RNA sequence: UUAAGUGAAUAAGGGCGCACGGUGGAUGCCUUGGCACUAGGAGCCGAUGAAGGACGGGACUAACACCGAUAUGCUUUGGGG
């Protein structure tokens, strides 16, 4: 789903970084104390920051 | 009845033949891996950090294969359904 993320600007970037990297973070700390019920939520999180970091690399040369 | 004479059968265990089992992995058939070559490509990698490794990445992950904090994967151009 990169043609979102190509439909934003550099500092939006940055920060929906911080959004998703949050997010690992209590996802991480649900699954140790018995909870979250849907599981792949986690790899998706992972590929998406990836992705950003990816377009990120692109477009600063 | 008494004398003189002749005397089988009976296996604690063993042998030979036969019948059925147990152990053990020979023989037959088979291939997932090898051996000797032919024709074609290619004949170097490295301070822009190599060859080879250590440690990590999975919902559960001891091991092997893959991958490197963007970690069981990211973008892009083509094929395929």
Do not use: H, P
Not at 4 to 30: G, H, P, S, V, Y
């Amino acid at each position: 789903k990169v043609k979102e993320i190509r439909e934003l600007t550099t500092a939006e970037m940055l920060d929906k970084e911080k959004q998703l990297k949050e997010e690992l973070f209590n996802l991480r700390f649900q699954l140790a104390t018995g909870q979250l019920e849907n599981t792949a939520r986690i790899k998706e999180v992972r590929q998406s920051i990836a992705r950003i970091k990816t377009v990120l690399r692109e477009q600063a040369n």
